Amino acid sequence: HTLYAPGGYDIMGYLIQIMNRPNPQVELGPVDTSCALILCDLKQKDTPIVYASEAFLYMTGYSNAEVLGRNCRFLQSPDGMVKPKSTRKYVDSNTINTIRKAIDRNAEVQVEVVNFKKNGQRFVNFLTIIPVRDETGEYRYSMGFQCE
Amino acid sequence: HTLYAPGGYDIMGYLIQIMNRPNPQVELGPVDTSCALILCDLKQKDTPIVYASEAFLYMTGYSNAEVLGRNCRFLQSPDGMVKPKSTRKYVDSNTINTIRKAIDRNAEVQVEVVNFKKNGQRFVNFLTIIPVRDETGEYRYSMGFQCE
Ligand SMILES: *[C@@]12=NC3=[C]C([C])=C([C])[C]=C3N([C][C]([O])[C]([O])[C]([O])[C]OP([O])(=O)OP([O])(=O)O[C][C]3O[C](N4[C]=NC5=C4N=[C]N=C5[N])[C]([O])[C]3[O])C1=NC(=O)[N]C2=O
Ligand SMILES: *[C@@]12=NC3=[C]C([C])=C([C])[C]=C3N([C][C]([O])[C]([O])[C]([O])[C]OP([O])(=O)OP([O])(=O)O[C][C]3O[C](N4[C]=NC5=C4N=[C]N=C5[N])[C]([O])[C]3[O])C1=NC(=O)[N]C2=O
């Protein structure tokens, strides 16, 4: 059965994997459940978000139906309109390249980035993205760790 | 919360210890952030709840103040009144028997029990209880996974 994971993903399992991941690159610190986190599909074009907890939804002001299927970059514009390769007027291009390259290289990244909520409120997001290997060792997803 | 998840018992740590238990008696399956969690200390009088995740609070409609320091059986009555060794007038007593026995033998139990929310709403609770063994063999904590 899958009664304890209606979201569709064993988030507890990927967090455990990260906790014990060999040679931890960035310092994650304490994550439990109430943490604002999301999971993206690396095996799907533009790494769409395939799971958004809560906390994350509450924080960003977005619903589960508003974020699932989209790339987390929409949080970079006060109107949630962020196209790939484009130039953000309020977010450091440098920062996002660090995130971009780390992701393509399956490398860990931890930065501070300017994000925006649905209503348009700006805020600093202490983000960290750690790739996740599936049952077979291949990196199929990436877990997102957001914090205001 | 501030960073990602500090204030509290090492819940993440027990979830890890639990998934890696090489004696699976019951099947937990995948677990996400929607899973209501509670940690109980079997060595304290009447196995009181020492930790309750927000999902549990949200599910049972009670607050942290209201569930902390108490035995989860309070959920077996629409008014929160459930004294030990007493006959409940709604619940299936076999489910209540099975649970208690399991808990006394430090055995994993998985049932569907009849619970009640703060507002009186009745719900079927897919309850799974797994005790955590100590590095010394002793069982102090027991983790409960509940989902309507
Ligand atoms: C979000 N959380 C979250 C969670 C998870 C699980 C993942 C995988 C990622 C996030 N992110 C990041 C977001 O999804 C995305 O990865 C990020 O926006 C960067 O990637 P992308 O594809 O948007 O990059 P793009 O469009 O190329 O823009 C970069 C920027 O840099 C300039 N650029 C381009 N080539 C360059 C250059 N500068 C210098 N040198 C070269 N060679 C461009 O002009 C662009 O402006 C999350 N994002 C978020 O904001 N918040 C989270 O919580
Ligand atoms: C709750 N979650 C949760 C989480 C965690 C971590 C634990 C450890 C436990 C739970 N539970 C269970 C609850 O706290 C409690 O353990 C459970 O209700 C059983 O224990 P208890 O103390 O209530 O038993 P009691 O009072 O002895 O009553 C048994 C009952 O059965 C009948 N009986 C008694 N002797 C019998 C007999 N029938 C037949 N033969 C004999 N010899 C009587 O009718 C008794 O009244 C959680 N509980 C919950 O409801 N929801 C959760 O999510």
- Sheet with strand A122-133: strands edge to edge: A49-52, A37-41, A139-145, A122-133, A109-116
To test the contact with chain A by mutation, choose from B32, B56, B112 the residue with the greatest count of A C-beta atoms within 10 A, namely: B32
Containing A122, the helix (H) or strand (E) segment is strand A122-133
Percent helix, strand, coil in chain A (nearest 5)? 25, 25, 50
By residue range, what is the domain housing residue A110? Answer: 1-148
Residue B128 with chain A: CB contacts under 8 Å: 4
- Sheet with strand B109-116: strands edge to edge: B49-52, B36-41, B139-146, B122-133, B109-116
- Resolution value (Å, 1 decimal): 2.8
Q: How many structural domains does chain A have?
A: 1
Residue whose token pair is 């995948």: B30
Beta-carbon separation of A10 and B16 below 8 A: no
CATH code (residue A112): 3.30.450.20
Q: Do B28 and B145 meet the contact criterion of CB atoms below 8 Å apart?
A: yes
